[PDB]
Each structure stands twice: as structure tokens, then as C-alpha cells.
Amino acid sequence: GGSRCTHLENRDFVTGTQGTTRVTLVLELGGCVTITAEGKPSMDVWLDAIYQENPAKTREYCLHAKLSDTKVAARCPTMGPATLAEEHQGGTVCKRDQSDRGDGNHCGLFGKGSIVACVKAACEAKKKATGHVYDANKIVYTVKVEPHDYVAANETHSGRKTASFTISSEKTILTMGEYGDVSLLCRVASGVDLAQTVILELDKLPTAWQVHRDWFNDLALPWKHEGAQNWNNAERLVEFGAPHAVKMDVYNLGDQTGVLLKALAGVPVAHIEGTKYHLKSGHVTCEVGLEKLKMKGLTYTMCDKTKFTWKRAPTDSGHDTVVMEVTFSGTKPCRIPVRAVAHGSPDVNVAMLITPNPTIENNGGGFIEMQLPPGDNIIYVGELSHQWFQKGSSIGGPF
Amino acid sequence: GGSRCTHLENRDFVTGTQGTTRVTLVLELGGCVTITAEGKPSMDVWLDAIYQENPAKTREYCLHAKLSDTKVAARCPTMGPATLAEEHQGGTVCKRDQSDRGDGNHCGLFGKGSIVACVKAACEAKKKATGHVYDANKIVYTVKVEPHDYVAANETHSGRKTASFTISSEKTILTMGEYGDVSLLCRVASGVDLAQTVILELDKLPTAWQVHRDWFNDLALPWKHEGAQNWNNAERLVEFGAPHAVKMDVYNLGDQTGVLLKALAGVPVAHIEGTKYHLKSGHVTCEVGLEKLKMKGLTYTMCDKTKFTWKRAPTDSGHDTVVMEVTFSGTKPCRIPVRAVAHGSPDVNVAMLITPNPTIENNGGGFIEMQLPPGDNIIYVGELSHQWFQKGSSIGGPF
Amino acid sequence: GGSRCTHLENRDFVTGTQGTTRVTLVLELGGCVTITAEGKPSMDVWLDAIYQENPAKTREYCLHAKLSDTKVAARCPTMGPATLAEEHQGGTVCKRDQSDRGDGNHCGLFGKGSIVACVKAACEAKKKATGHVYDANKIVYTVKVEPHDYVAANETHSGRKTASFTISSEKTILTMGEYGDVSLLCRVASGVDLAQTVILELDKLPTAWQVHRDWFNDLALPWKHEGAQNWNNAERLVEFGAPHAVKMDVYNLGDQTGVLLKALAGVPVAHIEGTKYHLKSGHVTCEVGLEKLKMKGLTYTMCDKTKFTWKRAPTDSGHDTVVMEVTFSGTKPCRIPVRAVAHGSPDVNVAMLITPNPTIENNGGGFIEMQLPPGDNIIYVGELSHQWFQKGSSIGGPF
Amino acid sequence: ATVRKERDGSTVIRAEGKDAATQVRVENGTCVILATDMGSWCDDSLSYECVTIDQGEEPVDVDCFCRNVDGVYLEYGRCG
Amino acid sequence: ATVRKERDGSTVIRAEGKDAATQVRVENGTCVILATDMGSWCDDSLSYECVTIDQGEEPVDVDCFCRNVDGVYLEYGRCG
Amino acid sequence: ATVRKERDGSTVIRAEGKDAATQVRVENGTCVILATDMGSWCDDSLSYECVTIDQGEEPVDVDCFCRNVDGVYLEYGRCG
């Protein structure tokens, strides 16, 4: 088996005079809570997924330019200026210079003549760095509730109830079988600052990343929008040669996918399940309204501080948070005594836990996710300790 | 008459041992809730308006350039470079080229001479595409409470109490007459992702739109800021001609208001009431604190699934949500059984309701507002169904 | 002494049938609340600090360019184009023009020759306008609770408990001595719209400011990123001279720190405590879960409307809010009757209070912080009045 | 067409659409206007040099030329 | 190399890497190709003028020149 | 002013404000400095060519000229 589901505490709910019970739940991504009533079967409530189905395409950058139909026009020093039809056309890069002219290139007077070279600038197939922006109100927070048996893939779980939430959508009523009609009011909260977030995706090893807004907008590469035929700032990959009598060569600066991947090393990888653009960080704080029932609350005792060992040493989660796993040898179940101090002051708690109630359960438990301030810090799990260095906030590598 | 006001359910409130009652309300824009106490008159609580009074001017784009005082300066091939006073002046577009010179234009030596043409670039009257950015903390959420009679325009409603809220301002105490002192704690939530929002307004048919941040910043038009005299990137509407002996003509690229309106087709229209910049989407979740009273709660029964018909078929609201109206022939009042499934899986609810409690009331009711995932979906109102195709997230048309 | 701490009201908490007490607190920055239980000592709960430890460097602007190793290359009118190694090098500004050539500069044919001048463009020491972007989820909201005595600097306060919160981290359990285990669920809310916020900092009188995103990104100055060696758009401070036979001089446009400071006049000053980037505006709304105790609630009576005088007249706080101090001559303690009306309608309350419960306490009290709509408004503190003109939303001065 | 002495040493001719393919007398010499893109006077106006060509010299790539009079310019509005 | 009359009055020569340092007959005259940066025909192609130089005139700073034939251009793909 | 042979074939003269309107001997010839925008040596330095003008040829639009010595350049700091 192995269930992380945390039993409901007495402090989390209040029973009114008129028989109404207001159960307050903190549901992180993957985090489960067991709610039980006197005589009614145990129900597991959890936040299943945080995602946005196919978000808007902001900017698409060209990594490798597709140059075609290059034309060079030139005239004698006494004759008029050299002109091309591509100069007043879209998706073309043109350069105007002066070429040395004489009798060797058939011109009556020795001097400088007008020369212009134009090339149709486009993008090579499967060589685009597309960007995606999240719409805060469009992100779905799937909350699922099932009884505390295994059922096949095609068949559905008996008693399973699905309730999706957003910033705009907050209240829904569920017919939770034995519990009757329950009012679910789930407050949505993202674990990623969506405002300063862009999903950099390459045409189909990682091919999608969660990059910063400021890093993305300042990429020195030709860009365009979803629907546009031509490329803006196409000269970023076009290099013109020296102007000869009637010839002016055009050079491609080459592929920039390798230059991009080097700067994208260490950048948090984006999670795309088909069309669903998932966010691996975030939570949902719900307030369940129950009627005509007595709630069964189980308050936790503190775990033995001396009986703790590291199952998995504190490491980076991959979304600016710290993850750790602990092994407890004492009596189960209990509440994990977890805190942290910044190197210098050992009396002020600096731990900002993502896990609302870290507990050692009868079956499983022991997973702790937390936020720590930058610099050298010491994480304490009772008597058990570990030094962690949190890296400072960054937008990305230089380009 | 016709009131949409939904009666308070037993699940929404809890009565304490010390006599305190905590009533939890979900108030969407236009959405009303009726709160009643034993012996006290019924009170209608609703969110009246979501707006920001005259937000900050970000960027102002020029649609039609006002060209004036064009000057052309030229010198012989042996003489020094041609100079103009406007070259080192603000709000001017200058181009440097080579002109063919000889005896026909009075120059001792046949060759190429220096030529420069300068034009004072400004904007034509009533031809500006001004942008406005919302300050999340400055948006007012007006909450009004009145007794459940008609009063004149100049005269005020007896018993009406107004309470405005923001992200910063959350707690206020109202002297709700018969109910005494009530503590209102309203949590503010926008229905629009303000971070990726710009209000594109034209000088005074729609003249204001709610455009995306990324679409607005990448507009290929000359721009400036509120207070600046000169225009940045003014060459975007200025086209210089071929360089003749002493003449170089300047051409205006014309009006771009028509090009903008074509790209703005289908874009959600902005709502401006004088100086108030309204947001037609959003809600406010309040927690009312009452003392020395017994609350009257009326729990709803489910409506008859077979007795439903479409008053107004599911359509786009105009702010990325789906609106629908239903007609019920059975017994009133009741709670609307509304759900939705994505084409493929008919067991998972994909409906994300904006309306917290859709109900068929004695007088009115039957309005349902909801969020749906992109693609082909089927909306269910009991037995009554309708297929809806939600369009994918977009920033706007190409420019 | 002088304590602003506001005693807990009966409306703010509810005692359940099973003995659980849910205390709801509104904690603004600096704002304190006194929570007391029957037989247990009084505890002062307050929001100590709102900050982010060293946020990400977005863009760094150069105010004074450091020009070095200027090289000029020129060739005769019949000879090939003039080339320099610095043209295809990073962090260099190059200009190509035509120079008058003849026998006086040793050239066989009279005409126009190719000339190119290159300069290594960098930034002068301590002359950078660095920008910082806040990560909404990384901002720490320090909540402290101590008993209602003075202790030394090195020694710690007996009974003091620290609990830090973010958008991601919301639930923590505190062992509040006599009160036992208390569940703290603090909802984080910023007083600044972080999405449209950039911290403009100069190299070490104010040296740090809270500027708007749109104002910062449109600064006409050479820019680069944290880690980059070269400067983008370096030509913004480089002015090339007239092209002579073999010489082309380069001019520096000078220091722009004085031009920046003039535009930064009136802009809200940023608060940096070493590495902590503080936000002087914001609040935290908590829901304390208590067990096995009886809560002592003290409900306030309204202050005498006629007995009010201004201690400090309404003025700008320095973070888009209005601050005021009042003196009360009547009986203490009581709740301040404070409201506001916009010039025209004297029946609609336009006051949006930052202070959740303004009260005249036995010792101190009388501080009122509020948000007001733009235009002429009249603030009322009972019978006592004052006219205030709130300025419209702005991004900053012109550059 | 109006002939006037500006703030500079230059002599400025302010002409309109009616002055196209006409001759105007400037000081001790004569000036010929051949500009076809002319119109009524307004803010949107183009100003350039009227080349002082020598004895019997034919004009090449120019729409304004003068004889016996030096330092002469032409200005016209394009609102017609 | 293929000789053809385009939509314009110009005569276009489509050459490849094999046509480097070779001579092609165009109408009543002859054209010489000296371009070294040649290759197989594709979308990425460069097109320029083949200067019609007079009797006994030596070519200066050009890789394509023609005799007795006017208005002649050269095009080649760079996919080799 | 200091005369030196660089990494290239060019002969470089490093002069200051005192070297304005003075003559320096370079190899078998002589070099004349007329630059007025000179100063003390620093990072902010301008470098250009000193044109080798023929027998009795007068200098036109140049502040540095040399006689009997070819491939000669001048460099000076602008920190004065």
C-alpha cells in the first residue's frame, strides 16, 4: 500500500449549535487528508492536479533562419540608386552600401555606385522557441474525494467525486454519498508567480522549461506572433558581406538551439501532459460545510525527537522548494517536530513548510517539503539535523 | 419584480457556544444573497461593482503621424558633410544618403555628395491608442446591503449600507440596524489576470478594449509616455524617398486606426463609466460576524432533472466565461443540478461555476455562469443537455 | 510604554460544541491584536515584517559609459572597404561613413573613401541603475506572538514564538505555552501589485526606489543582464563626429544619474535592510485553532463623535495610502467611528481602511491608515472632518 | 510666389500649386519652379535648395534652379 | 548551366558547382563563370548581374562577365 | 612623444598634450602632430592614421602627416 493521507485534527473543525460543521482543509499538490464522521466511512480528500489546458502563445523565437531567393542590384556612379522589389516587401532583410565601379565592371566614370542586396528571411522547420503565458484565472485545481480497494483502468472508482476550482470558481456542492450534500469552498493559490512566468517550448530529453518573463523578452533572436507570416528583427541572424562591383553575399549566422540549451541548463523543466500545462507547486485551502453528522477528530501527539534518521537527505525539488524524507523508529502515529534556523540565530524559526501537517502515519508518512531563506541554514527534525544552502533568486543564464 | 437573490443555506453558517454566528458568503458580480435572522427583517447582500478609478497611463501609440517643417540640406562631392539643426533635436526623423552631383546642380567635380532630410514628427489630433494598467491593490469591490419598495433617484434607500473592499482593505464594521454591529471580512478576488492586462483606449461603437500585455508591447507603431513631448520609434510611420541632387521627399505611411480595429475584432470590450474602469468578471468571499441573534437558514432540495428547458442557449459572456438561462416547470424553490463533461469521459465533472449556488427561486432565478476547458464539452442541467466548444487561450490578432 | 495592540472582539471568534475555538485575526504590518483566555495570560499577536531576501536582478542600466581603445580605419576611393577587428567583437560601437579623399591625404583619385571608427563600450565604476523583481511566492510574512517587561539585545524574549508565511506556506502548529498546541493558518496578501513592480537600486540620501514595470523597461539607456560581459544598445550614450580624411572622433554623452534622480523625485523610496527587501504595505489574515480552553472576548463601544481632534492631519504614507492620528478626550477604551465621502455624494462611504479595527486604547491608539478614491474627498472621524485630495495613478516621471 | 529674406543669408520663395511651371524674379536674377508635388500652404511643408547654375548650364536632376542670384531656397505646403 | 529568357528582358543563367571556371554561350555572345562559392540548386540561392564588358576590357572585382550580350544575370544554389 | 614598432607592420606614436604643434622623427623620415584635442594617456584613447604625403604635397583635412616614412599611426589619451 503506502498512503500519505493525514487524519483530520480537532483544531481544524468546529461543530455549531444548529448542527453545522465547518471543516478547514489545507490541500497541497499530492497531499491527502482523511475526514471521518461517527458511523460514516472514512473519506480521502486530496488535490489531484494544478494545470492550464493549452495556454496562449506569446512570442515565438527563430533559432535557425531559412534564407531564400537572394537578389543583388547595382548601378554606375553617375546613374540613379539601385532598387529591388523585395525592399518594400515583408519577411525580407535588405542592406544598402557603396561599391567600387569602373571600366572593369562597365561604368563610364570611376567612383562609388549604389548597391542593394535582399534575402527572403523565414524560419527552418522544427527550429522555433515558442513561449506560453499562463492566465491565472484559467488554471484548474482538481480536487478529488474517494472512500478509504483497487479498480481497473476503464472502470471508475465507486464513491469518487471530482470538483475543479479556479480563482473565479470557488463554491460547489457535492453529494458525498453517506455524508449527504456537502458545500466545498476551495480557495485557489499558485506556487509559481505566474506574472513573471513564460513556458519556453521547442518543437518535438527536455523540450519545455519554466523561464522568467524578463529573461524571455530580452532574447537576442528574431521574433513573431501566432498568426504572423513575417519575422521581426530578422537581421539578428543575417550577416551581409563586403560590397563588390555587382555582388554582395549574404551569410547565415547558423543554428542557435545549442546556445539556448547551454543557457537553459539548471532551469526548472516544464511539465506538459499532452495539452495540459502542469504546475508542480501550489495548494488549495478548503472550507467544507457538513450537516446532520458528528465529526470524528484525531489530535496528534509529538514524535520522539531522538528517534529520527534521513531516508532521503534535503535536496532541491525542482520548483524553488526543499524536499526531504525521514525514517522514524518509535511509536506510530505522531506529528513530526520540524523547524529550521539560519546560521547565526538559533532561536528564530525560518522554516516555511509546504506540507501543512508533516506526520509519521501507521503505514507511510515522513515526507517534508519546505521553503528556506537564501544562505546557509540548518534544518531540524527533532534532534536530527542537516545543513542546507539555499541559492539566491535568479532569472536565468546569460545569452 | 424579478430578484435573483439566493436564500442563505444552513451549511454556510455556524452558531457558537458564546452566541457568535459566522456567516460565509460567496458574492459574484451582480450575485445577491438573502440573510435572515429570527424576528429581524430579511437583508439582501450583493457585490455591486468591481472597478478602478482612472488607472495609470502606460504607453500611448500614434496611429496617424503629423509631419511638419521638412528641411533638406545638400553639399558638393568635394565639400564637407551636409548638416541640419533638426538632427540634434527631439521629435525629428532624419535620414543620411548620397546624391548624384555635377554641373547640372552646380558642383565642380562629378561624383556623390552628402544629403540629409529632416522632418518634425508628432501625432495628429484624436489619433492616439492609449494604454492603461490596473493596480491590483487599487481596484474597489463595492459590497451593498439593503432590506428585502422603490425610492426616487435623488432620495436614498432606507437601510442601505455601503462597504468598499480591496486586496489591502479587508475588515470593516457595519451598523446593520436591527442586526446591530456586524463584522464584515471580505476577501477580494479578480476574474481577470490583471498582470497580463492592458486597457487599449482610443480618443473619443467601441473605443476601449481589454488587450493582453504581450500583444500591446509588441505593436509596431511610434510610442511615448504621459508627459513626454517627443515620439520614440517615429520612423515606423516615416518613409523617405530616393535622394535627388538637392531634394529628398518624405512620405507619411497614413492612418493605422483601421488596421488596429480589424485586429481588435472579437477582443473583449472594456467598460468605462466616466472615470471608473469596470471589470465585468470577479467575486468577493465574505465572512460576516454576528452577535446576540439566531440565524434563519433555509436548505435547498434538488430540482427535477426532467423538467428543464433552455431560456437562452449557452453562449460567450464576453469575458472568457460561458453564460446560460434555464426555465423550470416543476415546484419552486430548488437548487439547480448542473454539471459538464468533456467529449470522451462522461464520469468526470469539468464545470467550474462562477455562480456559487444556481437556484430556481419563487420569483426569478435560472441564470448559470461557468468556466469550461477548451475543446468540445457537453453541459448538463439535469436531463437537459447542450454541446459547447470552448476556444483556446489567445493574446489577440496579428499586426 | 504606548501599545497599539487591539483587544479581541466576540464577533472575531466561535466556540464549537466539541471544545474547538476558531479565532479570526486581521494582522496588518505593525498592527497588533491581544488574545486572552480565561485563566491564561494575555498574548500579543502581530505581523512583524513583509520582505524578500535578495530578489532576482532583472535589468541593469548604464548611467555613465566608460569608452576605451578607440580605433579609426580609412581607405582611398578606389581601394576596398575599411575594416576593423572590433566590428565583429562584443561590447563595441562601430559607425561606417564616407570621407572626402584626395592628394592632401595621399589618394590617387579625388572622391569619397571608406571610413570606420570603433570604440570599446563599457560602464564606469559605481554608475549602474540595477533592477530587482519580486517573486510573489518568495516574500516572507513574519508573524510573532509574545506575552503581554523588557529584555536585553543578546537575550531572547521569554514566551516569544516566530512563524513565517508565504503564498505557498500557509499552515503551521505553535506550542504557545499555557495555550498548548495552536494551529495557525495565515493567508498572505501583498499591499503592492508585485507584477507591475521593479526595485531600481543605485550603487552605494535615497539610493533605492519602488518603480513601475512599464516605466523601467522603457528607459532610454544601455542595458545588460547579471552575468553578461557586453552592453546592449550602447549607442544610446555614444555620439560619433563628422568623418574627416582618416579621423572620426567619438563623444561620450556624459553621466545620466542626475537626469534619473530628477525623474525619481516623489517616487516611493524602497526599504532595504542589508539583503532583506522590505514592503511597507500589506497584511495577513489568520485563523487560529485553539483546543481545551475558554476564550475571553471584549466587544468595543463606539467613541464619542464630538470629542475628536487631529494629532497629525491626514497625509500620504509613502505607499499609495493615507495616514492620520487622532486625539480623544472622552472615556477610554472605545472603537473609532471613521468614514469618508467623495465631494458630491455625502451618503456613500468611500473609505477603505488598512487598519481593521481603529480603536482608542487605555494606553495608546488613534492611528488610522486608509485607501481613498482619486479626487476631492472628506474624511470623517465622528464629527471631526478633513478634506483630502488623492492623486491619480501614475507610473513615473518622463525620461 | 512670395520672395523674402530670412533670418539667415538665404532668400526663401514660398510657392503654391499655381506657381508650378512658372518663373519668379529674385533680386538681380530669375528663379524657375518646376515642382509638380505642390499645394496649399500648411504645417506639412517641404523646404530645399534652388541650385544657382552658371551661364548656359542645363539643369540636371532638379525641379528648382536660379540664374544670377546665389543662396536661394524654395518652400511649399502639401495640403492640396 | 542553363540559359533562359525570364519574365523581364534579362537573360538568366542557372549554374551549379560543376559550372565553376567554365564558359557558357548566351545568344550572339559568350559568358564566363568564375564563382567559387557555388553548389547544387535549392531555395537558398544568390542572384546577381554578369557585367557586359567592352572590347578587350579586363574584368575588375567581378566573378561573372559577358561579351557581345547585354542584360544577363547569374543564379546558383548554395546547398553543396 | 614615443616612437615604437607594434605587433603589426605599423609604427605607432604615443603623444600627449605637450606634443601638440610639434615635430617627431620617425625612422628615415619626419612626422608632424597638429591635434588640439590631446591630453594625458589613459584608457579613453583615440588611434588613427598619419597620412604619408608625397614630395611638396600640402596636407588637406588631416591633423597628422608624415614625410619619407610609410605605415605610421598616432594614439593619444583624452584625460586632460
Residue numbers in the entry:
A (entry chain A), B (entry chain A), C (entry chain A): -1 to 146, 149 to 204, 209 to 403
D (entry chain D), E (entry chain D), F (entry chain D): 1 to 80
Article excerpt on this structure:
The prMe-linker-sEW101D construct crystallized at low pH with sE in the post-fusion trimer-of-hairpins conformation instead of a dimer, with pr bound to the sides of the trimer via the same intra-protomer contacts with domain II observed in the (pr/sE)2 complex.
The immature flavivirus particles that bud into the ER lumen display prM/E protomers in which the pr moiety binds at the domain II tip to cap the fusion loop, avoiding its insertion into the ER membrane. Maturation into infectious virions in the trans-Golgi network involves an acid-pH-driven rearrangement into smooth particles made of (prM/E)2 dimers exposing a furin site for prM cleavage into “pr” and “M”. The flavivirus particle’s life cycle includes three key steps: 1- budding into the neutral pH environment of the ER lumen; 2- transport across the trans-Golgi network (TGN), where the pH is mildly acidic and where the particles undergo a maturation step before exiting to the neutral pH extracellular environment;19,20 and 3- entry via receptor-mediated endocytosis into a target cell, where the mildly acidic endosomal pH triggers E-driven fusion of the viral envelope with the endosomal membrane. The fusogenic conformational change of E is irreversible, and the consecutive steps outlined above require a special particle maturation mechanism in order to avoid premature fusion-triggering in the acidic TGN during exocytosis.
